[PDB]
Curated annotation (Swiss-Prot):
Disulphide-bonded residues: C77-C106, C89-C134, C125-C191, C126-C130, C163-C195, C171-C182
Active-site residue list: C92, H262, N282
Identification of the protein by name: Cathepsin B
Glycosylation sites recorded in the entry for this protein: N176
N6-acetyllysine sites (modified residues): K204
Included stretch of the parent chain: 81 to 333 of 339
Amino acid sequence: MRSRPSFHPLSDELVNYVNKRNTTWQAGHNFYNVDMSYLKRLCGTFLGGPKPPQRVMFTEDLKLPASFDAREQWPQCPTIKEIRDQGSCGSCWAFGAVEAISDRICIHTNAHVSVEVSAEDLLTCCGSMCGDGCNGGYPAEAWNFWTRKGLVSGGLYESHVGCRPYSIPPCEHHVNGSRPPCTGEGDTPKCSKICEPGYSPTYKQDKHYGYNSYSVSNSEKDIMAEIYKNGPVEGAFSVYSDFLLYKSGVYQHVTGEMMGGHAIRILGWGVENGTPYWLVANSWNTDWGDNGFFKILRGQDHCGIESEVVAGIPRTD
């Protein structure tokens, strides 16, 4: 870490070049203080990892809306609106999964059950199967663990919600009053199979399993139909430096180096000022981009957004 002198990562020069570019989005400084280390620990998804066995498709001329938003479609599912924070840990491969899973539980058991699945449980109990914890992982294997061992409930940091709420404090940037500084130093907590005190049922009793898991076929229409009847899904794309600068509009890479891979939740689509896009939920807290969400160019496999999408259906009784 660079103690306390010259803070802030990206130059106003990058922010200004993107803005001078006059593209479909506007740049702004999302990060101050943060060490360059932290910014890389944020992109914790390995692209081109293992794929799920299956791959679904749709072969009927479905009539899908011009725009769509799972939050509107499913107003009764509180988790669909929620934005989570991964802290100084590359657990996004796990976040995109538990988030989409929380949504699907509520959707597929249509209304009666709404729970926040533990990203913690996943981050800590999958193991080498999923990759290397806070240093990165693979989305496909996260869903895998859901099918095999399932996941328990667990909300936000210090929320007292669920069996295992996240134990990694929010580093929603910093600046202000020396809040937990965003650092890249952060181990992966251990797989503890015990619910937080003052919470029934028990850990193996509070488990939620998924059926199988699959890939959506790298087709705009296919990815759209899937979300339409099954709910949000997990995806991953290549994060370039300028992306960390997002404020609003439809993001289109214009400059910067590839920071790495990053998994996210895709919950809808639309068109804005003529540019087709995906409505995406990031996991860098709600004081980033457009309240935790952002839009990215759709229909051109931009930065790999359409390349690694996966999901699965939930257990139920």
